[PDB]
């Protein structure tokens, strides 16, 4: 009564967006190490039971289309849905290869009124990106 | 009827306004921590227990090394946003 129903044929889809190289217009640098992260995440989320697909150097439009199209698939037989975003970021926004898109615009495709097959099911987003320019100096 | 915004979870690598750290040789701090916890406990622990332990490991195990002293010895805490209505186990 207090756990999500996991009795489905599939755990679910997991989309990994792995943005390493950015257009010169953006002025953002190469994200070395993000390939080791994607492979590690690929094996972990695979091992959890997800059907993982990695998409490399996406544009903002590809990112909105991948997530819009995933939203419109049929999840009747999936328990949940996961999306992992690895890219450059600023507050509330994520970098494509070409520019920024608001994180809210990627996730809104999965709201209860826009994806009935994930109603009452967890939708998980893991975001490795910057959210501003502040630094945490720490304290002993 | 149920709310349209229910049953999302956002696991961010860092808190709003802050940088997020990446080691080019070993990967980003958050992902190293996440995969390490998941490899050891992904099928035992509830998602909030998993992510809380990820929070702990990023907070304690990592401290930046940079040539720039303005970027030296900095720290990071990830940040979880939960609209979940139930406990989540991958089981």
């Amino acid at each position: 009564t207090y756990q999500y129903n996991m009795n489905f044929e599939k755990l679910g889809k997991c989309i990994i967006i792995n943005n390493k190289n950015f257009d010169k217009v953006t002025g953002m640098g190469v994200r070395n190490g993000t390939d080791k992260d994607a492979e590690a995440l690929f094996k972990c989320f695979r091992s959890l039971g997800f059907d993982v697909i990695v998409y490399n150097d996406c544009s903002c439009a590809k990112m909105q289309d991948l997530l819009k199209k995933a939203s419109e698939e049929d999840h009747t037989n999936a328990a949940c849905f996961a999306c992992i975003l690895l890219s450059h970021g600023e507050e509330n926004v994520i970098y494509g290869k070409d520019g920024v898109t608001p994180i809210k615009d990627l996730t809104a495709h999965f709201r209860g009124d826009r994806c009935k097959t994930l109603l009452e099911k967890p939708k998980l987003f893991f975001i490795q990106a910057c959210r501003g320019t502040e630094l945490d100096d720490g304290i002993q | 009827k149920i709310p349209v915004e229910a049953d999302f979870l956002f696991a961010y690598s860092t808190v709003p306004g802050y940088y997020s750290w990446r080691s080019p040789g070993r990967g980003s701090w958050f992902v190293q921590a996440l995969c390490s916890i998941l490899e050891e406990h992904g099928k035992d622990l509830e998602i909030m227990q998993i992510l809380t332990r990820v929070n702990d490991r990023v907070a304690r195990h990592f401290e930046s090394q940079s040539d720039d002293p303005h970027f030296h010895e900095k720290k990071q805490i990830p940040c979880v946003v939960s609209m979940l209505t139930k406990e989540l186990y991958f089981s």
Partner: peptide
């Protein structure tokens, strides 16, 4: 280590 702009 590096960060994920210097605005």
């Amino acid at each position: 280590d590096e960060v994920x702009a210097a605005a």
